[PDB]
Every structure is written in C-alpha cells, then in structure tokens.
Amino acid sequence: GDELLNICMNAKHHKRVPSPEDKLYEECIPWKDNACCTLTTSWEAHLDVSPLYNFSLFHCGLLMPGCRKHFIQAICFYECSPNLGPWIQPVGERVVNVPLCQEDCEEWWEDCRMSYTCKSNWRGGWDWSQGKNRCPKGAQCLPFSHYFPTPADLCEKTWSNSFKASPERRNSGRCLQKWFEPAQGNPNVAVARLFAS
Ligand SMILES: *[C@@H]1O[C@H](CO)[C@@H](O)[C@H](O)[C@H]1NC(C)=O
Ligand SMILES: [Cl-]
DSSP states (O other), X not given: OOTTSSOOXXXXXXXXXXXXXXXXXXXXXXXXXXBSSOHHHHHHTTSSSOTTTTOOTTTTSOXXXXXXXXHHHHHHXXXXXXXXXXXXXXXXXXXXXXXXXXXHXXXXXXXXXTSEESOSOOSSOOBOTTSSOBOOXXXXXXXXXXXXXXXXXXXXXXXXTSEEEOSSOTTSSSSBOSOOOGGGOOTTHHHXXXXXX
C-alpha cells in the first residue's frame, strides 16, 4: 500500500503501468508475470546492437557470450522490473543506485573478465561520429578486468550509477537481483516493499 510499489519509470519504452506479458524473449522471461517492458522491448534487448540505446557492447570486438548474457539480463531488469520504484528519480525519469546483490555483480565481473572494452566509465566520451558508438582516440581496447578492476566498478560504471554494488548477498532480504530463475519466484518484490516503507 504505497505509491512506489508496482510502478514503471517514465522512460521511452516503459509501459505506463506494469502488467503480465504472455511472451517475453529469453533473458526477459523472469518478468513475464508482471513487466514494465513490452514484447518488442524484450526482442530489441536481444539484438546484436540494441536500438533501445544504440549502444554497442561490441565496441572492442571481443565480447564473449557469457558476458553479453549478463548485459542483456541487465537491460531486461532495467526495462521490465516493476520493483524499482524506490529508486526512480528525475533525470524524464531514470533509476539511481538500485542495490544489486553481491553475487550478481561478482558473476557479471567473472564472466566478462576476458572480454574487451576501452573505457572505465561508459557514460560519455564515446565517438558517435558515424552512427554507433566507437572508442575515442587514446582509449585502447584491453580486458574488462583492466577498465573494471572490481565487480563494483562494472556494476556501477556501466549504467551511469543506475546500479549500486550492494555488499549484501542474495537472500539477504536487502538487495535486488538483476536476474533470477523464473520457477522459484521473484526475490525482488519483498525488498522493494521494504525500501518503499
Ligand atoms: C539511434 O537510436 C535511437 C534510440 O534511442 C533511435 O531513436 C534511432 O532511430 C537510432 N538511429 C540510428 C541507429 O541511426
Ligand atoms: Cl524485479
């Protein structure tokens, strides 16, 4: 019984109120029961270079499937979760400092360790001269482990602080998962409820 529960942020494609989606593509499935994302949003989240933001995850070419999987999951979470209300902020809305559990950022970091990027902060500095985003002059492509030394850096500096690397572990009751198994239920509802109150 609070205004911050079961709402979608005022962003480009977000549905105005959450509601079930019978069909969401692969990495978006966990949110089928109640989603801020449309079917086409879940499709575009899986395209080689998504039009959701025209941000290429392949700006350094060497992006391994398990790394891209985490990023698609993060897009789904951002676009679909009806449980981000407590973190919705004026940018015309976004989220800021959603607390992601330790394991989410740790697994994300490990699975991207060997992929390549050219920037430690993905907000700004990109060269969009010919459409897509390219690495600027000086920014050499090195492993993720170089530009993102810790899991916290990857979680926080990839989405301009939309995400906060929580010290809390999964099943703490205090932090959200960017992805979860569809069959075991949504672990983020109760956490959102606690932040709303
Ligand atoms: C760039 O992406 C935006 C998505 O915000 C879209 O409106 C636009 O059509 C895209 N333009 C391209 C890829 O030239
Ligand atoms: Cl959620």
